[PDB]
């Protein structure tokens, strides 16, 4: 018993909208903000709560994100997205221009 | 209750329901015999065709009808493995699983085998590990424990006895339903500890009731009889003396006895004196380490065979087995549940993980190994221990203080909550006389709390151990280091440096790496090669900046020299894994043949190293280790010399570590050498640490299990040693009351032999490296309640005199004395002769009277005559029990008089060896089930070993091998099974 590609990917589409935790783990976030932070100046401590409010905000910048690229992705007359998709959303949006 | 605010908002309504149902995708969502595991296979399918082509390689098509595998199936037992075929299995789940063993084992092997730059030591190493694996693989088929029988039927079966079966090194989950046959022909030892794991004497819920009136204990100068084992030594008795006489005042004590002297003995003897002895049977709960739980299941299973010890590990599923089928003997009540299990063994990792599921049970005794892992009362593991419901609790630990007293005092409140405060913390500094008064309280505080029992006390066979504290010079690369970090120069500490990520936080951390290996540091070793080696790189070189790096390497090399000169082999402890690499490339280019335990290793691996590390055909002359890994159980007999290339904080860590080479019977004198950098950081570490040395002396050295005037004075003179410091045939392996021992491993060797670039490796050692390098390039590469229990006990055993232990304990009888249950079955016995005689005199004149009536009445007819015939075609009251069988009470207790003396007379050595001989009974054929003279003796062995009229428990003794020759429309019944046991004792005697 196979299943249709796309009904798994809609199964998801409907799970992780409703709950709310992280989708990115910890330790690989941590690790990515301190060397991410390490070259605008050596030896800096972080908070717990200064890692996990980076790692809500990313949540939320890339969810957006995603949205935004969905939409170009359907405008285009496509169900994959694409990377013009992402350049798409962030250059109406103002950040590549 | 109702909103006292609304809102005057005119928005529409939401339905703020989140909740989703998938029920509307199920037109593509719903609208167990498989490969599982591969183990062996065979270079012959069916016949040897022959010894050619036995060249090249095969492919994956080519294996398809050349090899066999060995098969062990999903949801099998490891004992219904095949030999099959690719052809023979068609299309199974996990042929995925079959293509992966085929391709990675079958190409990698003959890759290795037929390479030509394989050496024999990769060779024989994968040959090792593949039996390794075979035989790990073959441990499965043996049996280790019985979990549960049933009765299930199979496909007209009819009823089939079928026990659940737990494997060697399997686990819960894999524990299956098998038949009762194969396990009886294959370990029946296990199938008669399970029999006897039925109808046990010792239960939870038949333990004794001692509320602060526990009897007083007399010294044991003999091992007890119930602790079977091997054979108890004196200082073990004396402490199982010294732990019934603190179970005996109601106390809680530390077994602080050093490692290798056996305190899982100990803890089990007493565990089993607990049990026996004073009857306290009941659910007890011991906390192990996980790596050191084999070495207690195997102690329990010989030391204590008689014992219902579980093990609590693995999966959820495997607890739940665990759970469900061996804690309650009633799982399938709702009220109480009373345990059935004696000891739980145990880990923290599932102590924290089903506190609900083990706190809410009424435990007798807990036994925590290994209490330095409780010696924090912050953690999670100490809130959850403090919080079980034990009366009575015991820490088994070989250190009991590591760091200060907070520890010590963190046990003693674990151990008994309240009556024991510290509150004042120590100061060398001081050394006034209330700080003497306050250790000599804490020392008569604790004393009979703490039994310890050093190695130097007992087996006068231990070679003695000396350690030598050596300090050498830094290197300028670790000088100007060291002056970059303290004085901090992250300009300087970046120069050549392309990304520059100098880290400076944790000061005393970069500050140890420095004072270790300059080469620890990113891009430094770049800088060491091309203002020393000349920018070229070639070997050499390199190795020379390994030497001369560090002011350690230099001491370390010329050990390493002075000990492959002689006969002998190192370990080397290290803190750092990364200063472990740093020696592992070291004594790669250098070419010595190293082995390796850290973290990273897998437990597999690490088992292999030391197997072949303990071997007496190794080649290996180097071992290393991180320091804080491996536990307590790693066993390096072979070694001889300990070197510390870093200083622990915590000095029980060192003595742990060089204690894995001092352990009990080794047969060389063992010697230390702790490499100590001048002038640097590591100092203050070995000041922390002679300070815990001190502390540890003080209290625990001096509290063990006239002079207390002197006293006084060697406090003070610890206390003023404790005060100063200590920094104001070099490396001869050689030797030659106890206060001024202690004074000694102290001392600190300094050593200065500078020695420049060039003068190492010399004309031997260059003339062999380069030619290696050279032919490098060239290959490239009494009530009425116990009456009518004693009835049915005479109708099971017999008589009640000689079996009035069995039945009392067995709960066949109530809380009653034994000498009032044998005075009421003996006068109950007496009443039931003089009541059957009484009917049976009666009963004849009656017949006699009828018989003359008949005659009479015959020349009439020439009615009475009928009245004759209907007399020609025995219950009493004892003390309360109306329609007792007294003629069957007194013929059953003859019959099982007789069959007990008949069975012991000639077949004491083996009852199933019984035999009826020349005596032929009645046949049995018109029965169901095939009847012969072999049947009637099995069925009378049972008698004498389970009891009359016990149908289940006959059935369900596969010794006897009736199991599918009773039913309980079939025959033979439970009616006629007690009809043809009476008439077999009846035609016998």
């Known amino acids: 018993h196979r299943y249709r590609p796309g009904t798994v990917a809609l199964r998801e589409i409907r799970r ?82 | ?128 590990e593949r039996e390794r694996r075979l035989d790990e693989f073959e441990e499965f088929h043996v049996p280790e424990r019985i979990i549960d029988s049933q009765r299930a039927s199979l496909e007209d079966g009819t009823s089939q006895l079928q026990y659940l079966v737990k494997w060697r090194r399997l686990n819960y989950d894999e524990a299956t339903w098998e038949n009762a046959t194969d396990i009886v022909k294959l370990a029946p030892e296990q199938v008669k500890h399970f029999q006897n794991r039925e109808n046990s004497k010792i239960l939870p819920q038949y333990s004794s009731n001692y509320t602060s009136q526990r009897p007083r204990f007399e010294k044991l100068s003999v091992q007890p009889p119930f602790i079977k084992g091997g054979e108890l030594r004196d200082f073990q008795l004396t402490g199982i003396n010294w732990m019934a006489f603190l179970w005996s005042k109601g106390d809680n004590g530390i077994l602080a006895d050093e490692m290798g002297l056996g305190k899982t003995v100990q803890t089990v003897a007493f565990i089993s004196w607990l049990i026996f002895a004073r009857r306290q049977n009941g659910p007890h709960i011991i906390v192990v380490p996980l790596s050191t739980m084999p070495a207690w299941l195997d102690t329990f299973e010989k030391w204590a065979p008689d014992l219902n010890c579980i093990c609590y590990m693995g999966n959820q599923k495997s607890r739940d087995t ?45 036994a925590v190994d290994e209490a330095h892992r409780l010696k924090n009362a912050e953690s999670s593991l100490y809130e959850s221990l403090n919080s079980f419901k034990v009366a009575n609790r015991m820490l088994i630990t070989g250190t009991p203080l590591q760091n200060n007293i907070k520890e010590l005092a963190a046990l003693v409140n674990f151990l008994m909550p309240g009556r024991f405060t510290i509150d004042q913390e120590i100061d060398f500094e001081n050394q006034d006389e209330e700080q003497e008064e306050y250790i000599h309280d804490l020392h008569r505080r604790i004393q009979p709390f703490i039994l310890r029992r050093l190695k130097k006390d007992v087996e006068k066979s231990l070679p003695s151990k000396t350690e030598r504290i050596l300090r050498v010079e830094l290197s300028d690369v670790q000088t100007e280091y060291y002056k970059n970090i303290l004085t901090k120069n992250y300009s300087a500490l970046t120069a050549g440096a392309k990304g520059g990520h100098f ?136 070694a001889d010399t300990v070197v ?106 300094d050593y200065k032999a500078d020695i420049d670039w060039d003068d190492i490796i010399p004309e031997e050692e260059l003339k062999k490296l380069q030619d290696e390098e050279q032919k490098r390039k060239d290959e490239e590469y009494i009530g009425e309640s116990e009456v009518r229990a004693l009835y049915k006990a005479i109708l099971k055993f017999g008589n009640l005199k000689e079996i009035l232990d069995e039945l009392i304990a067995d709960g066949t009888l109530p809380v009653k004395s034994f000498e009032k249950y044998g005075e009421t079955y003996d006068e109950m016995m007496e009443a039931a002769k003089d009541c059957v005689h009484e009917e049976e005199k009666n009963r004849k004149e009656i017949l006699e009277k009828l018989e003359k009536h008949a005659t009479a009445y015959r020349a009439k007819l020439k009615n009475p005559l009928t009245r004759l015939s209907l007399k020609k075609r025995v219950l009493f009251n004892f003390k309360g029990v109306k329609s007792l069988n007294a003629e069957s009470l007194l013929s059953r207790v003859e019959d099982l008089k007789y069959l ?75 009616i006629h099974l007690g009809r043809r046991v009476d008439y077999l004792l009846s035609f016998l005697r």
């Open chain 2, 900 to 974: 007990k003396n008949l069975i012991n007379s000639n077949y004491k050595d083996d009852p199933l060896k019984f035999s009826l001989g020349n005596n032929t009974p009645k046949p049995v054929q018109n029965w169901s089930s095939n009847w012969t003279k072999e049947e009637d003796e099995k069925l009378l062995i049972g008698v004498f070993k389970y009891g009359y009229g016990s149908w289940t428990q006959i059935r369900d003794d596969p010794f006897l091998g009736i199991t599918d020759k009773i039913f309980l429309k079939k025959v033979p019944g439970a």
């Open chain 2, 503 to 638: 880290s400076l936080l944790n000061i005393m951390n970069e500050l140890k790496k420095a004072s270790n290996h300059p080469y620890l540091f990113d891009n430094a070793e770049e800088r060491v090669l091309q203002k020393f080696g000349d920018g070229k790189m070639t070997r050499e070189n390199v190795l020379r900046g390994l030497i001369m790096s560090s002011g350690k390497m230099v001491l370390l090399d010329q050990l390493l020299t002075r000990l492959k000169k002689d006969g002998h082999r190192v370990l080397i402890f290290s803190q750092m894994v990364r200063m472990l690499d740093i020696l592992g490339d070291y004594l790669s280019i250098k070419g010595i043949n190293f082995q390796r335990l850290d973290g990273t290793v897998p437990s597999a691996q690490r088992r292999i190293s030391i197997d072949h590390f303990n071997s007496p055909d190794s080649n290996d002359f180097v071992f290393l280790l991180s320091t804080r890994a491996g536990g307590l159980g790693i066993n390096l007999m072979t």
């Open chain 2, 322 to 366: 665990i759970r469900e089928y061996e804690f309650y003997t009633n799982p399938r009540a709702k009220g109480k549940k009373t345990m059935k299990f004696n000891v739980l063994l145990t880990t923290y990792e599932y102590i924290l993980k089903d506190r609900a599921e083990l706190g809410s049970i009424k435990w007798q005794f807990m």
């Open chain 2, 644 to 749: 510390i290339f870093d200083s622990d904080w915590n000095p029980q860590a060192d003595l742990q570590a060089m204690a894995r080479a001092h352990r009990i019977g080794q047969k060389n004198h063992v010697m230390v050498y702790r490499l100590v950098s001048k002038d640097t950081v590591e100092e203050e570490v070995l000041e922390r640490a002679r300070k815990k040395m001190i502390l540890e002396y003080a209290i625990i050295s001096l509290g063990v299990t006239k002079k207390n005037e002197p006293n006084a004075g060697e406090l003070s003179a610890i206390l003023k040693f404790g005060a100063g410091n200590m920094f104001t045939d070099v490396l001869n392996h050689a030797e030659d009351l106890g206060g001024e021992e202690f004074l000694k491993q102290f001392e600190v060797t």
């Open chain 1, 16 to 97: 992780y909208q409703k709950s709310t935790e992280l989708l990115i783990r910890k330790l690989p976030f941590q690790r990515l903000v301190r060397e991410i932070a390490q070259d605008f100046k050596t030896d800096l401590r972080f908070q717990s709560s200064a890692v996990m409010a980076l790692q809500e905000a990313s949540e939320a910048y890339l969810v957006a994100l995603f949205e935004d690229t969905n939409l170009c992705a359907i405008h285009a007359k496509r169900v994959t997205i694409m990377p013009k998709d992402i350049q798409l959303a962030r250059r109406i949006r103002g950040e590549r221009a």
């Open chain 2, 1 to 128: 209750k109702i909103p006292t605010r609304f809102s005057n908002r005119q928005n529409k309504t939401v339905n703020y329901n989140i909740d989703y149902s998938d029920d509307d995708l199920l037109e593509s969502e719903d609208d167990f015999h498989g490969i599982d595991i591969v183990i062996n296979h065979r270079l012959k399918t069916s016949l040897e065709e022959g010894k050619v082509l036995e060249k090249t390689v095969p492919d994956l098509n080519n294996c398809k009808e050349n090899y066999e595998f060995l098969i062990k199936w999903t949801d099998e037992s490891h004992l219904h493995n095949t030999w099959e075929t690719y052809e023979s299995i068609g299309q199974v789940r996990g042929l995925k699983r079959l293509d992966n063993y085929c391709k990675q084992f079958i190409i990698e092997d003959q890759q290795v085998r037929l390479d030509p730059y394989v050496t024999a030591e990769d060779i024989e190493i994968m040959d090792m």
